[PDB]
């Protein structure tokens, strides 16, 4: 028993992290087959980032201006191209540790594991959620750019995130592995509005189901509600509106626990309106929204990879 915020095992991704250097700038790259993927602003100086013309700056670069190091293995760059906000460096050797993988663009509310890296060396792993406003609240120090987020299904690594920037508000923004930013952000050092964030309602409900499975039941009440009535409360507390699709995804959890989704919604409504009265749920004094329904099912059944 027990419930923890759990990241995927990072071994398959550790074997793909490389160090990319262009001039005075170093960051992390992702080495899959014979291509290295990294944020395009590796070609920028500190002054460039204020208003970079990436096409013009990349013209000044040749294959030999990119230094790629995999621990101590030198990679010979034989081609380079810019795809949106990522640089694709063709190297003359395929990574022998390349896992089975896909590139995925995830939806807001979904979760992934981040392997934080510095100078091409992994430092730690943690689980994140893509916020409804397409930011993440991570832990990214200077030099962490190029760190990737991923999910693992059996033997397949689905890469969904590459880190690019820290907004002046302290939250983090990045792209998919095709170089398209999540949200409205651009890779330049300017003030950038993230927009109102909301709480991921279906994730909070899944976590409440996890609480019941593990023995925390005090928040269960004798009330029920309707989808429309609940959504009036959700809007007041800046929660995502619940749809029937969300109700459907929560189906397995409701079957196991015998608690209908609308009954759990009425529990959540009372928590929103009355707080927790200084009590805790799964060791938290706040409503946690970084566990998807799939995350809860994984940890309550024990699936491996």
CB-hemisphere CA count at 13 Å for 177? 20
Least CB distance to its own copies at residue 114 (A): 8
Q: For residue 136, what are the CA distances in angstroms to 94, 128, 250?
A: 31, 7, 24
According to the binding rule CB under 8 A, does residue 6 interact with its own copies? Answer: yes
Find tokens 């109700």 and name the residue: 247
Q: Which of 160, 109, 154, 118 is nearest to 139 (CA)?
A: 118
Candidates 53, 72, 244, 301: give the one binding its own copies (CB under 8 A): 301
Return the bridge partners of 75, or none. Answer: 68
Nearer to Na ion, 87 or 145 (CB): 145
Least distance in angstroms from the C-beta of 280 to its own copies: 7
Q: Answer yes or no whether residue 115 interacts with its own copies by CB under 8 A.
A: yes
Across 23-53, b (16+ Cβ under 10 Å) vs e yields: eebbbbbbbbebbbbbbbbbbbeeebeeebe
Query: Contact, 147 vs 163, CB < 8 A?
Result: yes
Q: Which of 95, 111, 144, 201 binds its own copies (CB under 8 A)?
A: 144
238's enclosing H/E stretch is none
The residue count for binding its own copies (CB under 8 A) is 53
Binding string, residues 250-279; x marks residues near its own copies by CB under 8 A? -------------------------x--x-
Among 73, 156, 186, 286, the residue binding its own copies under the rule CB under 8 A is 286
Question: Cα(161)–Cα(11) distance, rounded to whole angstroms?
Answer: 17
> What 8-state DSSP symbol labels residue 233?
H
- The helix (run of H) or strand (run of E) holding residue 227 is helix 227-236
Active site residues: 41, 145
- Eight-state DSSP code of residue 97: T
Q: Which two tokens stand for residue 250?
A: 């929560």
Nearer to its own copies, 2 or 258 (CB): 2
10 binds its own copies (CB under 8 A): yes
Taking the least distance from each CB to its own copies, the nearer of 10 and 267 is: 10
Tell me the closest approach of the beta carbon of residue 184 to Na ion, in angstroms. 19
Tell me the closest approach of the beta carbon of residue 62 to its own copies, in angstroms: 29
Q: Which of 98, 214, 254, 256 binds its own copies (CB under 8 A)?
A: 214
Residue facing Na ion at closest CB distance: 145
Phi-psi region of 277 (alpha: psi -120 to 50; beta: other; left: phi over 0): left
| Least Å from the CB of residue 139 to its own copies | 4
Binding mask 111-150 for Na ion (x = CB under 5 A): ----------------------------------x-----
Q: Which positions touch Na ion (CB under 5 A)?
A: 145
**Where along the sequence are the contacts to its own copies (CB under 8 A)?**
1-11, 14-15, 115-119, 121-126, 137-144, 166, 170-172, 214-215, 275, 278, 280, 283-286, 298-305
């Amino acid at each position: 028993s027990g419930f923890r915020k759990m990241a995927f095992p990072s071994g398959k991704v550790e074997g793909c992290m490389v160090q990319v250097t262009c001039g005075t700038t170093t960051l992390n790259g992702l080495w899959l087959d014979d291509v290295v993927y990294c944020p395009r602003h590796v070609i920028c100086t500190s002054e460039d980032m204020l208003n970079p013309n990436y096409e013009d700056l990349l013209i000044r670069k040749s294959n030999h201006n990119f230094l790629v190091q995999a621990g101590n293995v030198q990679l010979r760059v034989i081609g380079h191209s810019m795809q949106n906000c990522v640089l694709k460096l063709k190297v003359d050797t395929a990574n022998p540790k390349t896992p089975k993988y896909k590139f995925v663009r995830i939806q807001p509310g979904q979760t992934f594991s981040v392997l934080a890296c510095y100078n091409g060396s992994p430092s730690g792993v943690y689980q994140c959620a893509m916020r409804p406003n397409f930011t993440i609240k991570g832990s990214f120090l200077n030099g962490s750019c190029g760190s990737v987020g991923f999910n693992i299904d059996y033997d397949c690594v689905s890469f969904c995130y590459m880190h690019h920037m820290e907004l002046p508000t302290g939250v983090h923004a990045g792209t998919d592995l095709e170089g398209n930013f999540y949200g409205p952000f651009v890779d330049r050092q300017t003030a950038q509005a993230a927009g109102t964030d909301t709480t991921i309602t279906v994730n909070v409900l899944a976590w409440l189901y996890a609480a019941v499975i593990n023995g925390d039941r005090w928040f269960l009440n004798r009330f029920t509600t309707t989808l429309n009535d609940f959504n009036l409360v959700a809007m007041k507390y800046n929660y995502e509106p619940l749809t029937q699709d969300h109700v459907d995804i929560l189906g397995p959890l409701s079957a196991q626990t015998g608690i209908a989704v609308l009954d759990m919604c009425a529990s959540l409504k009372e928590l929103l309106q009355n707080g927790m009265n200084g009590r805790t749920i799964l060791g938290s004094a706040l409503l946690e929204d970084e566990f998807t329904p799939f995350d809860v099912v994984r940890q309550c059944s024990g699936v491996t990879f």
